[PDB]
Amino acid sequence: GVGVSTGSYDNQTHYRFLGDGWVEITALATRLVHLNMPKSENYCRIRVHNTTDTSVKGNMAKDDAHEQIWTPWSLVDANAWGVWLQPSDWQYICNTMSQLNLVSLDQEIFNVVLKTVTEQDLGGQAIKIYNNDLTACMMVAVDSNNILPYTPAANSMETLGFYPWKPTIASPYRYYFCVDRDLSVTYENQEGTVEHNVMGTPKGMNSQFFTIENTQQITLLRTGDEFATGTYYFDTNPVKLTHTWQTNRQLGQPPLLSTFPEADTDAGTLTAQGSRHGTTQMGVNWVSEAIRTRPAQVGFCQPHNDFEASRAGPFAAPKVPADITQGVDKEANGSVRYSYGKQHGENWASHGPAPERYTWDETSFGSGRDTKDGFIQSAPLVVPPPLNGILTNANPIGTKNDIHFSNVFNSYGPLTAFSHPSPVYPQGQIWDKELDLEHKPRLHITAPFVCKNNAPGQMLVRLGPNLTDQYDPNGATLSRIVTYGTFFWKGKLTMRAKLRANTTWNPVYQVSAEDNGNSYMSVTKWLPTATGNMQSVPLITRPVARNTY
Amino acid sequence: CQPHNDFEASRAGPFAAPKVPADITQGVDKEANGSVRYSYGKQHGENWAS
Amino acid sequence: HGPAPERYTWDETSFGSGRDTKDGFIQSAPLVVPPPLNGILTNANPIGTKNDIHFSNVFNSYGPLTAFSHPSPVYPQGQIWDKELDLEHKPRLHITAPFV
Amino acid sequence: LGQPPLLSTFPEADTDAGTLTAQGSRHGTTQMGVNWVSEAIRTRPAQVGF
Amino acid sequence: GVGVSTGSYDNQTHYRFLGDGWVEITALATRLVHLNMPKSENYCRIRVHNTTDTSVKGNMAKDDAHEQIWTPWSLVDANAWGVWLQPSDWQYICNTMSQLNLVSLDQEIFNVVLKTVTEQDLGGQAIKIYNNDLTACMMVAVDSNNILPYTPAANSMETLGFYPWKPTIASPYRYYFCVDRDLSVTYENQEGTVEHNVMGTPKGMNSQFFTIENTQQITLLRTGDEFATGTYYFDTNPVKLTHTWQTNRQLGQPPLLSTFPEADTDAGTLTAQGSRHGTTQMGVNWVSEAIRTRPAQVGFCQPHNDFEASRAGPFAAPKVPADITQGVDKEANGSVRYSYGKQHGENWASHGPAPERYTWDETSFGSGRDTKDGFIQSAPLVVPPPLNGILTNANPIGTKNDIHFSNVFNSYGPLTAFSHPSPVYPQGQIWDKELDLEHKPRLHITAPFVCKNNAPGQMLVRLGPNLTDQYDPNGATLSRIVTYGTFFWKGKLTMRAKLRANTTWNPVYQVSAEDNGNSYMSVTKWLPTATGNMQSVPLITRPVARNTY
Amino acid sequence: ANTTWNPVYQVSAEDNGNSYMSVTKWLPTATGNMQSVPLITRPVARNTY
């Protein structure tokens, strides 16, 4: 059965139109994967303590100590938009559809190749000779019951390459292990010492060591073999591809004008606040837009840069993304900073290790928050407030300046309503497994699609141990033949989307390429260089706007 | 407990975050528990004699 | 002997969700590698004007992203089921019992 | 929660620890404008506990 | 047919629940086996005499002289718990079931690989090059009729490795041959000489030379071939997973109290022995618990360190295991000392050849024996006995001190009843063939399950002779090509067990992991190290207790 | 279901002593006094994500 292909290459994208503007999109993707021998044939429990950083006063935030289990297995993760689409398509979809959902997922591995290396003399120097091992095999498995810890490769930019004509590698499988960790609070030059900075030991009640070999059904496959998963159907909710704008101050019937502008430069006027009709929740005897009653609360104030902590150290409580407003309160509204590699977007022309970075600013305009302009007034309400009857973003909380109410205020409540963070093209994660907790979270921020049911099983691979003539179970030296392989992976992602409707009179915002220049959309960014260097930056995901109420 | 007379703000100015109504207790904390003030015309209730 | 009641204190086992007050803190707006004394509120600084009363005591990080374990049943003396409150807007659970 | 970081050096004795790539040149995501990334500042799915 | 896998890898364990708490457990195991060329293409009759030890006065016990037949064949033995289960499972089973039995056994060999080695120059040095031989074959056979001598590999810790992710080897087939042997008794510095210490010659009436080639059906298999045995059904008895406690003194109706304690510190009292009702086998006119009549005898006194002897030297008569009591008479109640390798449990971090050792103490509490407290009284029975009317464990038998009645006393009899030695997890043997003797033994101590019928045939393997261009039948020099191979083995062990019932009010003993510490159950023992070193120590097999009568 | 390699935490009685699980706590006294303290309800651990 050797000497015959076992699959087809395909990286196309098909659109099928049903009636009523529904559209079935079929994304096809193939990649050539390169697999190397595992560093060690063993499972390793590894501790990681960066004392060299944590021991410096006021450096809690740079902490990244934990203990992990390292498996000799690697995994094929395609959970990332960049894998399935072609920039242009994403453009098309976003410029044309109003919503999109996940449907089915299909995968198969084939045209397996295994090789061994040996060295020989060529003018005194040692060169490598490459030979085909036929009998050697590769190993595959799929945790469809999700026994193993879920570990999105998109988490670490280790998915597959977003470029079809170029090979890729797999991310090695590693998962968190349980040990307690404590670290104390200190600041820029606080006198004293860093009291605690310890790393615990294995606890009897929380130790979980899993092995691939003991939980999955492993399929062996030599070069002539091939493998495929059945079809997986997602049970997920759709995502809107339209953005919002109305803010708590554009909900309802705008006030009744009493005077109309007579020239394109004038403004209009309303009836006097003192004799205007309406409703508020203030005892005053007037009414103005800002004090007026509205249906619910669009967006909300989030406590910023809140590090919390629990039995394994401290961490930044995640923020629900939102627009940054005029105050460019990026960090305040949880925009996201992406740091990625060449194989995932970074220009190939760039140098050294230096990662390329981008910061995503949500487009949900009706829900952003401007910190500087936020404030609280005191009990009964007073026309203009006395210095003592109003707290602002200047007054210090606790006893430090720089630290105002905003930082510890949380206006989340029953009336809080909002937009769902949008998908981010090249590097964004696509779906995610839910947390096994009786009381779930209204969403995840790392991804758009959360599986309501069991999620797609993770695909694990590993090269079969290739021994030598000399073997001994008790020997610390595991001498094995140098080996490595390649194989194609092919996936079929199926989505369903609906065409948008045209209701405005005025034209509308659309994503578009643009002549060679500065503008973010210089078509050149998406073109090859004279040597072939490619680059793929993110695109706006929600170009068009929709009424909110 | 609801934060009272919390003006928030975003790209089109500031505004009073709405309050879920509730009883005012003995402390008559009206504004504190979001009671509602209605300002209406004759055709909607106001005495016509006013 | 006597009336003296016997007492016990139940400590939940949901380890992934506990909170260590002493180690919790807030940093200021833009983020700074090591923070200046003024750019970080801790569990030492006093809120209002009393010591002993830090941000922890009035802070509530509950939000859309908050997820968690359901308090477990307690054997000998624990309550088993409970009636729900006749309120248009119910509570995500009761703490006095497991089964509502 | 998620994929623990990629080690760049492996312990050679049961007493050693491993090491990751430098925060300044590590891949990933956060909600901070800084130009590095560490476990505690890193982005996670949701908030466990509160 | 080359270049295609011939099997699946699987090392899972499945539980199926039928009604009435019966449970079908299906243990699946796969291992990668490494096979080397046979040392010699011949069958060898080898004598082994350790004169260097036996010739020293009073060293009989260190004797280990015999003559054996060495076959060029190797064997795959999976007869050992450690092969089939995962620590945790053994925990589960023991903590949950009340009994367990053997049902069926399935095996198959596949994905055969054969390779040859040659040397070449790489900078003056000679390095090894590894090449695939396709036409070369491997040889398999199964003595399902048990023609060959039965030889449990567990006997010598040569079964397969208890760790799935790590390769293994086969134990070479060798069997005892018949020759008489004599050795005389001597002690620490007895004057005189070691009279006899001889090794005989082949006897006409007992010489048995068997060959694989002449008794089994050999199957040849190249890389593309595969092989499987039919299914084997065991006809065995179940083993209880519960331990006992009642001793001869807790059988029946405890005596009638006449006074009840009035405070938690007091004791109660019975009617006077002189006027108490009951039965004994003593002429006295009173009755007390220790002299009272009981149904039968739980446990019994065994003569300890009884070396016996017969035509091939001396040996320690085996002891039926039992609890050691307070007197910690370990050796007296036959506890067992296990000396094993790394591949069978020993920590991989340990150094040199040094084997790891463990001593198993039976949990059958109702049947242990305390030597120091045992004694005999004289004929008619006397209240307190005269110095002359009672033999104790101080008085010397024969004429040596240190050698009391205990050592030659054997209370085994019609009324003797007892527990069946329990299975020992990682390293314990599982089943065994019965001895072809008209009068069988009530059990074996080396294993729990004795086949009432014919036992599973032993699986033998061997690499096919790979000749060179130069061959001559009469040449003493057998020049052959260096070759070695690998192949997977997969077995399906099927057991049937029943869930235990809950009848006590008080909680009960359960096996449990425990925080990192000293306690035998430090979860760490069952975890990998930062370099991956594994360790597997034995677990309690019968955690829960059961009433005996 | 049993999925880990390593053994796991289980509630267990324990010899007469200090440890919260001294079997005696769940036994009668010479006059019959009984006592019933709480037990751990969730001995085993589960992956959360």
How far is E57 from E300, CA to CA, in rounded Å?
A: 34
Rg (chain C; Cα; Å) = 20
Which residues are registered as beta bridge partners of E120?
E127
The total of other beta-carbon atoms located within 10 Å of residue A5's CB is 10
Residues 6+ apart with CB under 8 A from D31: A316, A318, A319, A331, A334, A335, A336, A337, D43
Enumerate residues 6+ apart whose C-beta is below 8 A from B38.
A279
Collapsed DSSP state (helix, strand, coil) of residue A499: strand
Burial of E501 (0-12, 13-18, 19+ CB in 10 A): exposed
A200 Cα to chain E: minimum distance (Å): 10
How far apart, in whole angstroms, are the C-alpha atoms of residue A434 and residue A422? Answer: 18
Q: Which amino acid is at A410?
A: N
- Residue E341, exposed/middle/buried by CB under 10 A (0-12, 13-18, 19+)? middle
Distance CA A341, CA E350 (A): 43
Residue F36: list chain C partners with CB under 8 A. 76
Q: Report residue D10 as tokens.
A: 């492996």
Q: How far is CA E243 from CA A490, D12, F39, in A?
A: 56, 45, 25
Q: Which of C33, C61, C67 sits opposite D46 (nearest CB)?
A: C67
Nearest CA in chain A to E348: A474
Is A132 within 8 Å of A115 (Cβ atoms)?
Answer: yes
**Structure tokens of E308?**
């016996």
Contacts of E380 (CB under 8 A, 6+ apart): E283
Contact E163, A209 (CB under 8 A): no
In angstroms, the CA E186 to CA C10 distance is: 69
Min Cα separation A328/chain B (Å): 11
For tokens 């289980």, the residue is F10
How far apart are the CA of E260 and the nearest CA of chain F, in angstroms? Answer: 8
CB contact (8 A) between residue F47 and residue A209: no
Best probe of the C interface among F33, F34, F42, by most C CBs < 10 A, is F42
3-state secondary structure of E54: helix
CATH at E503: 2.170.30.10
Cα–Cα nearest to A73, from A457, A462, A482, A484: A462
Q: How many CB atoms lie within 10 A of CB A275?
A: 10
- Chain F residues with CB under 8 Å of E267 CB are 30
How far is A514 from A454, CA to CA, in rounded Å?
Answer: 43
Q: Is chain A in touch with chain F: ≥3 Cβ pairs within 8 A?
A: yes
CB contact under 8 A, F48 and D48: yes
A359: amino acid identity, one letter: T
Quick one: how far is CA A377 from the chain centroid?
Answer: 39
Mark yes or no for CB contact F38/C73 under 8 Å. Answer: no
A473 in Cβ contact with E166 (< 8 Å): yes
The DSSP letter of residue E61 is G
Cα of A187 vs its chain's centroid, Å: 31
Give the angle E81-E83-E87 at the CA atoms, nearest 5°.
70
Strands (E) located in chain B: 6-10, 13-16, 37-39
Q: Give the dihedral sign, CA A527/A529/A532/A536.
A: negative
C-alpha closest to that of A420 among A434, A438, A441: A441
Q: Which helix (H) or strand (E) holds C14?
A: none
- Chain centre distance of CA E246: 26
Cα–Cα–Cα angle for A345, A350, A356, rounded to 5 degrees: 45
Cα–Cα–Cα angle for A372, A376, A381, rounded to 5 degrees: 140
Q: Which residues of chain F are within 8 Å of residue C78 when distances are taken between CB atoms?
A: 38
Contact E317, E332 (CB under 8 A): no
* SS3 (DSSP) at A300: coil
> How far apart, in whole angstroms, are the C-alpha atoms of residue E93 and residue E542?
10
- Domain of E525 in residue numbering reads as 1-549
Phi, psi of E407 (to 5 degrees): -65, -15
Measuring CA to CA, which residue among A489, A485, A334, A482 is closest to residue A419? A334
Residues 6+ apart with CB under 8 A from E488: A220, E7, E9, E30, E31, E32, E33, E109, E110, E111
List the beta bridge partners of residue E199: E181
Nearest Cα to E374, choosing from E395, E399, E348, E392? E392
Terminal-to-terminal C-alpha distance of chain E: 64
Question: Rounded distance, CA E60 to CA E307, Å?
Answer: 9
Which DSSP category does D32 fall into? Answer: S
A333 bridge partner residues: none
Contact E88 F29 (CB under 8 A): no
CA distance A68 to A45: 6
Three-state SS at E525: helix
> In A, what residues contact F, Cβ < 8 A?
147-150, 204-211, 214-215, 433, 435-437
D interface with F, Cβ–Cβ below 8 Å: 1-2, 45, 48
> How far is the C-alpha of C81 from the C-alpha of C84, rounded, in Å?
10
The helix/strand/coil state of A156 is helix
User: Rounded CA gap, A209 and E165, in Å?
Assistant: 14
* Count of Cβ atoms closer than 10 Å to residue B43 Cβ: 7
Subunits that touch chain D (at least 3 Cβ pairs < 8 angstroms)? Answer: A, C, E, F
User: Exposed, middle or buried, E229 (CB in 10 Å: 0-12/13-18/19+)?
Assistant: middle
Inspect the interface and report whether the beta carbons of F42 and C72 lie closer than 8 Å.
yes
Q: Are C15 and A312 in contact (CB under 8 A)?
A: no
Element (DSSP H or E) covering residue E516: none
Entry resolution (Å): 3.2
Number of A–E residue contacts, CB under 8 Å: 158
The residues near C20 (Cβ < 8 Å, ≥ 6 apart) are A182, A309, A310, A311
Could you give the CA distance from residue E461 to residue E114 in angstroms, rounded to a whole number?
Answer: 14
Instruction: Concatenate the DSSP letters of all residues of A360-392 into one string.
Output: E----GGG---TTT-EEE-SS--SSPPGGGEE-
B35–A290 C-beta distance less than 8 A: no
For C91, the token pair is: 């509570």
Q: Which amino acid is located at B42 in the chain?
A: K
β-partners of residue E238 are: none
- Test D39 with A68 for CB contact under 8 angstroms: no
Q: How far is Cα E163 from Cα E150, in angstroms, rounded to an integer? A: 25
Q: What does the alpha-carbon distance between residue E394 and residue C78 come to, in Å, rounded to a whole number?
A: 60
Q: Looking at chain A, which residue has its C-alpha nearest residue F1?
A: A147
Cβ neighbours of residue E72 closer than 8 Å, sequence gap 6 or more: E38, E39, E40, E41, E42, E43, E462
What is the nearest CA distance from D28 to chain E, expressed in angstroms?
Answer: 26
Q: Give all strands of the β-sheet with C40-41 in edge-to-edge order.
A: A313-316, A306-310, C25-27, C40-41
Torsional sign, CA A444, A446, A448, A451 = negative
E248 φ, ψ (degrees, to nearest 5): -40, -20
Question: Rounded distance, CA A493 to CA A220, Å?
Answer: 25
Please state the domain count of chain A: 1
- C–F contact (≥3 CB pairs within 8 Å)? yes
Cβ neighbours around E256 below 10 Å, total = 10
* Residues 6+ positions from D32 with CB-CB distance below 8 Å: A305, A316, A331, A337, C31, D41
Q: Element (H or E) spanning E533, and its range?
A: none
Identify how the structure was determined. Answer: X-ray
Contact partners of A by the rule of 3+ C-beta pairs under 8 A? B, C, D, E, F
- Residue E195 has which token pair? 């009279």
Tokens of A139: 């190993």
C59/A400 Cβ within 8 A: no
**CB-hemisphere CA count at 13 Å for A291?**
23
Sign of the Cα pseudo-torsion (E96, E97, E102, E104, in order): negative
Q: Which residues in chain C have Cβ-Cβ distances shorter than 8 Å to A182? A: 20, 23
Could you tell me the two tokens for A5? 């292909």
Return the residue of A nearest to C43 by Cα.
Answer: A185
End-to-end CA distance of chain F: 17
One-letter amino acid of A520: Y
What is the bridge-based pairing of β-strands E239-240 and E97-121?
antiparallel
Dist CA A535 CA A108 (whole Å): 28
Contact status, residue F14 vs residue F25, Cβ threshold 8 Å: no
Element (H, E) at E538: none
What is d(CA A114, CA A484) in angstroms, rounded to the nearest whole number? 6
Q: Which residue from A222, A214, A69 is spatially nearest to A139, judged by alpha carbons?
A: A222
